[PDB]
Amino acid sequence: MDPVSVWGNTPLATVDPEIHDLIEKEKHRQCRGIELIASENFTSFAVIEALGSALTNKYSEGMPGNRYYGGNEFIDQIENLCRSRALQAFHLDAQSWGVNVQPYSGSPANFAAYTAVLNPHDRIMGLDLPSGGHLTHGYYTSGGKKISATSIYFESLPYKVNSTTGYIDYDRLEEKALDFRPKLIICGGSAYPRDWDYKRFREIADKCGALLLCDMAHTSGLVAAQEVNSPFEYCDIVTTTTHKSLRGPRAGMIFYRKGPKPPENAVYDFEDKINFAVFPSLQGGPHNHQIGALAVALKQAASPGFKAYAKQVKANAVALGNYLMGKGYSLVTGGTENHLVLWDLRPLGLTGNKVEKLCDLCNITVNKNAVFGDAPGGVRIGAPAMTSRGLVEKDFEQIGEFLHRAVTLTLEIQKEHGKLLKDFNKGLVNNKAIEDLKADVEKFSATFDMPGFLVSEMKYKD
Amino acid sequence: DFEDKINFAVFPSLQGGPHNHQIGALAVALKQAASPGFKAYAKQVKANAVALGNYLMGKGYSLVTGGTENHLVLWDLRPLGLTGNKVEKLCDLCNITVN
């Protein structure tokens, strides 16, 4: 039996050189490309120190002051701190809003919210995936195969954007809701480049008797800084991830109205149902290292610096958008009001998969994305991650130039090898233009700061 | 065609007699710089600058370019609302000489 220090106190670089080396290679990759995945970010070292800590050792099933085991003196304080900081970050009165901070991620947070307020097979609507919505808001194929757990255990129906403007068609949503009669309407999405008319959603929900939930995962950092419409003014429940624009660990939260209802002396009934759904119905012990790390992120999000970050994210998305748009490219809705742009590639005859593939070869990470609701004909581009490395508008205009080069090279490989993926991949090999672009992206990326670790100590600096 | 132009610029164009005590002292310094100890000194200078830079950033101080690849660190004091004048003056009084 190994003495404690050999297995238990030796650092990772010695206990497991393989994993240490792979993480170091991943750190280097994060420092040598252009990260435009709109859901990604780079969190702080202080968050990561809480995440990688002894908090992982403690079981604390239940919730603070009402646990199933002992030894929770300090875990209770950490969870209570995290919860009160969550309410502060979003400027919520603790007598009108509560929050559960135990969900393991955003998707468990959504499914626990549904479990709390719906019965199995109850009806739900959310934004269609080709229109910018997320899997957890419901998804089934044309062949009827239920894919999302939301569509397996409840009855979902999507609403779409207008096929010519790309904005949410609020009239068709109201009509569909009166026909379908959902018990729950979901707003928020993954690839919608505009703000949300939450007042209109509330009017539609009240007209059809539905609860109204906003999944604010993508824009939660922007909501915290009061840079986009606040869903809390109008929604019954607000779910979120904590790792996207909020820049924290991977976790989820469920916010819920409490107290008297606005004008029978009726009161909200969400609190106990939401808490019970997370535990004991769906989850086990909370991940206390995530909760501690989340409390750190929420304190960082409440700071004047984070408000400046949120402004800069929106400004960088706009500058990138305008740059592409001055090159003659087409954006869905012709611009953005948030952290992302939707690049309609169809006027170029390119699929989003070809542009995504050549970009990845040049260390530019984007993702194909269906466009206007229609082989995805676009790509989604987000600003939070590279903004966190300190990039401002001119730097995002340089990102725009890099994207313009990558797309030109894609056209060039298509106009020489052909629109078939078996043919197109022939041009992606031994290609000096790709090799050059990659080199330029690498040298560009290396000039920027990186939160989360001591840069001078990284193993790979080439 | 640099050699003749450069030698001529130094003398007779710009300077008078060389300072031969400087040249002899410089010859000594160039012998010392060619030694394995000096290679280790130069590594140590770099390591010392990095270690100081990392210490300051850990306290929440801002370095220009966020680090160093050579012998110096540049410390941006504007985020603290301080001028270089005040910090230089105060620790000149504590026998710490910066600029």
Next chain:
Amino acid sequence: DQIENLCRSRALQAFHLDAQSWGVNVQPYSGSPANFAAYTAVLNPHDRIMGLDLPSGGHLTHGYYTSGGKKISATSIYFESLPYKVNSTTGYIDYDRLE
């Protein structure tokens, strides 16, 4: 002569230079005279020069004139200097704007 010849040869050795490819002059009184003699060797009066801007980390002898147009460095008095700057985001040399 032997001391200067030794200084020159040790200069070439300390920087790992082939004497068929590199020569050295070791008489400059200091660094500022060295720079100004180099300029005098290869430039005519009023020839154009660029060096790193002083707020971007450059040195007086690389050129310096004020917002008001006052020529401070002798480099800017006797030649026509224009500075280049670091990238305002990163603090590294902005190579594209220099080009």
